Symmetry: D2
Subunit: 343 residues, 4 copies
């Protein structure tokens, strides 16, 4: 089958196109014929070698994917060939205390597709039936593929970690990244008043159309005051920061006392600094968050089918232009998700 | 193999010994050679026909069980023949929203072993690897088999439903019967002051031995008054009831303002009238609870190995005497679990 | 000053106009010149004698009220004469554990204005500065007076008790009566899909205008079946009931598995028998709720100024017609609040 | 009256002994004749000038205090002369949304005694009746005084922020500090298995006697591994760090994935660094915590009266040796609290 793979751990030039045997489905497993694969930051991390070292090469990247059920292994129930589905990137054992508690993302054997094993940058992929979910009919394959990873991550942050509720002033940093665009929508869904920050008026323009109530350009090293102004001088109650590596000094200045700040986990190895004194004294909470319970995908897709949440496909390129896709992310030039059309 | 089948629905006499073929473990399944099967009131409802209608016959009852791993399916890890284990009676599909969230006991396809599928009243039983936990080595097989079902039910009521915490006055109804044995111990484990009620002086004496700080006899028409007197006149904060529909009026009377009452399988007789406006005006909360999440069996067994929680085996009977065992249980005379010894 | 005193306990005719001396504000107290006093079912229980026995006479009823600051005690800040305000009907000692925890409505000395102390059925009333909130400027005095009592009760039931969240199917009983008006709006505010039930077509039509997504008529012996049909057959997840003791059997039937039912002042007639084992087997939860924490009045009024929540004034009557007002309320005919105009 | 005051903002030499007019009680206020005053870190901070700048000098330090009610102002209820009491250092307005919600420590007007106004380093002090609590009879004045501030702070951290429960492995850093000794006890009370760290075997010896299950000396730059070893290799689930400025790099290495770490707020202005990448990726939560709801003191004292919690008075000196007391803290030479006998 056709697939993009990485011969080495370098820049986007390491991603090449080759042929690999079509994987076969095992018991309780399912083979999917991919129609679309979404790019994720996790991809670039592994591609550089900052994540998942000593990984078997060549490697097939890709955590987000959508398509049609090609074949089911022995003992499979709930899926058949021809069925449209989207992948749920969370691979867990399903036996440990964490999994049985609905916390598979905390499983000691937790693995994201394309991180440890071959992902969605191919025409085919096999995975446990439990990791497959029906694709909504009102969406295109590309749109479907862009949902899972970022929506899951933004859901844990906004709902479970920040406990967002109506009345809350939510600050979403760097509107434009996959996590951001979903966090803005989910936060609105929970009655929040969203304030989104970005580095260009163009991204702010898009954040506004996405549902943001107020927007702030952090190009000006005084944006925290603006955020304070927009929130009656008290600052944001809850903050969604998909990185923490962007003017975090300001973020905390924009955050209300007792405020909560959620930071989307990443294997970027980024070493920075976190203000102790004037952070814990103001009783601020800084919560690391990564992916989310696989159970979150069902209600997320439902809201997407109802139209309350929408995927944000900024660009689509052919699977073979995977390299070009990575440069689009590394150069941060697209508002929303980057999707690869497969087949 | 030897097994106690259910020829037809009716009195305990319908339970007879028969020879059934040995079940074979599927892909992710394992066959356990049973040593002890604990008796639950659920087995009685199935026997009488009150539960699980349209149930094929013959049927093997039994939700609780302990034993040794006999054989394991092809693709199965974490279990080998010889391993001592106890059964996690909760069966679900592990693919729906409820299951992925850990709330398997709320799965639309949720099933308790022995309720619809052959249970533990045999020398062998086959279940998914997800429903098997290591048997604590400090316990006898009859003690181990007695844990699961009641400890899980008592745990959801005390920990999740009632949110028992140190300083709480917890009231447990009818000691020695149902989930009281486990509820008194879990309650204390969470820092509460337990007040237990029973009918005989023996059971109350038995209650204190389990950790009950105070005892009350509900054979008197004014026992609710003693509970009030025993808690500074305010009444109990949290209440664990598995009988109800008889003393419920007394419980409601014994419950302090804003108190919480957790009800297990209170399928008693008449429902009188239930003095409402008493539960509303005083902001009381009545919570129904059946079983618990499979994940809860891990902390339980851990506390059991430490000796902070322990099962109470009231009587042991040979497997071929399941009938006599159902009699003992139906008359609620024995203090503790009735356990069948298989092999 | 003019006031409607309660000469004796009995029918609404016991309410008569009398001249009482003007109360004087203590140290941290303030005297409010009332403009409107909203009528609550509580005023009726006090009038009949069913509530607050040993109550000195004459007594001035009235828990809800709005007006202008008249005079303030010596040591008081944050209030000046001329300021428009609404009353927070919750009176507590503010020194006990319950009060310091915010749960003032659970204070052992908790008292609702007008229940034991002179209320709002007069031209002036004196209460602690802690029980006064700024009146939203976008509302008329009768609209303002209608908010507090019902919005606080509906909020604790929806937000704290039921934990309503987006995607939830909330069922509100008897629209236009009690806390339904507020519950339908708060429910929607928290992202639920509201199904409202009423007796007349007018009230149901009125319900949808308030945000009710679906409507059902409980005049039919099978209305519970419509709620089930209206929620994918599963039933309502959360239920707000302020009547009970009459349709409660229907509610329980309309409640989905593991559902929660919040009950306000369901002090209806007979209690029939209440089909238990249905609330236990299906793990249902019945929660009693009276009033709410004073702190909750702040977010409520904020949403009211934004227009996300709005009071519904059913009828206005001059203060001297409190008697006629109690009739209108006792017959549960008027849709919305019955508000007395003082000055 | 005799009292210790600070003429300037320098070392412990600025604390002098002088005479100041005896403060008079106002409405709803109470004058206390101090018998003992406990030293707190907050004291040294303000004494140096790192906290509460532009504060009126001379200033009377002291947040913790116990003694006898000297006189009550007009309109006081609940207290009379001769009554033994301990101070609740949290001064809040009692009107803002935070206060009425039981979150007075989050009030915008929150002030700790001795931080903004004259504290307990005198023979007399006046404060709102709401800030006074009855001293348990089984305790000496010195012992009583050492409870409030640190126990309150350790309570919010352990119970509210870390949500400690039985089964949890709690890591308490720097056993010896006021917060630590209380955190160890409260954590045990909630069923935790406590691991305490310190720099000398002597403090570890005392932490063991206090209730710590396991102890680790962080003098050895490899202690995190030891903590991991003691917790089956998974690390601590919850961590109490009353500073964060002590081997925080190790703390996070000793913390289990998904773990929670509570840091006691301080106006030390300590600027350090917080590991981003490998912290949020492991889904760690870092929670700033300061003081606690005044409501927490009641249940805390109760547990002290029951004997479940005990104050830890490491040393007592005469009020006039306040300077010496501060050097004992600045030189960190005492396990537990330092108390000043007054009068
Ligand atoms: Zn797992
Ligand atoms: Zn399921
Ligand atoms: Zn109170
Ligand atoms: Zn305040």
């Amino acid at each position: 089958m056709r697939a993009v793979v990485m011969r080495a751990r370098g820049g986007p030039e390491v991603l090449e196109v080759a042929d690999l045997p079509v994987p076969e489905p095992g018991p309780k497993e399912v083979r999917v014929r991919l129609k679309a694969a979404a790019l994720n930051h996790l991809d670039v991390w592994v591609r550089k070698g900052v994540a998942s070292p000593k990984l078997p090469l060549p490697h097939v990247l890709g955590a987000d994917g959508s398509g049609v059920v090609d074949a089911v292994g022995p003992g499979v129930e709930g899926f058949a060939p021809g069925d449209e589905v989207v992948i749920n990137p969370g691979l867990s054992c399903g036996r440990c205390e964490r999994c049985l508690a609905g916390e598979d993302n905390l499983c000691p054997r937790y693995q994201i597709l394309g991180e440890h094993r071959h992902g969605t940058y191919a025409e085919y992929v096999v995975l446990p039936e439990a990791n497959l979910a029906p694709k909504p009919k009102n969406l295109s394959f590309e749109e479907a593929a862009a949902i899972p990873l970022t929506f899951l991550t933004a859901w844990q942050m906004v709902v479970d970690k920040l406990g967002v509720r109506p009345g809350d002033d939510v600050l979403v940093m760097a509107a434009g990244s996959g996590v951001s665009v979903a966090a803005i929508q989910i936060a609105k869904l929970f009655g929040a008043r969203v304030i989104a920050t970005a580095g260009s008026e163009d991204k702010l323009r898009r954040a506004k159309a996405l549902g943001a109530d107020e927007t702030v350009n952090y190009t000006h090293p005084d944006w925290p005051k603006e955020v304070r102004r927009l929130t009656g001088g008290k600052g944001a109650d809850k903050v969604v920061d998909h990185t923490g590596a962007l003017y975090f000094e300001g973020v905390i200045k924009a955050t209300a006392n007792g405020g909560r700040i959620a930071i989307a986990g990443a294997s970027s190895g980024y070493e920075g600094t976190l203000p102790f004194a004037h952070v814990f004294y103001r009783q601020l909470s800084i919560l690391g968050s990564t992916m989310a319970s696989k159970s979150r995908l069902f209600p997320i897709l439902r809201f997407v089918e109802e139209g309350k949440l929408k995927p944000v496909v900024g660009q689509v390129l052919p699977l073979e232009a995977a390299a070009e896709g990575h440069r689009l992310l590394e150069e941060r030039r697209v508002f929303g998700k980057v999707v690869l059309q497969v087949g």
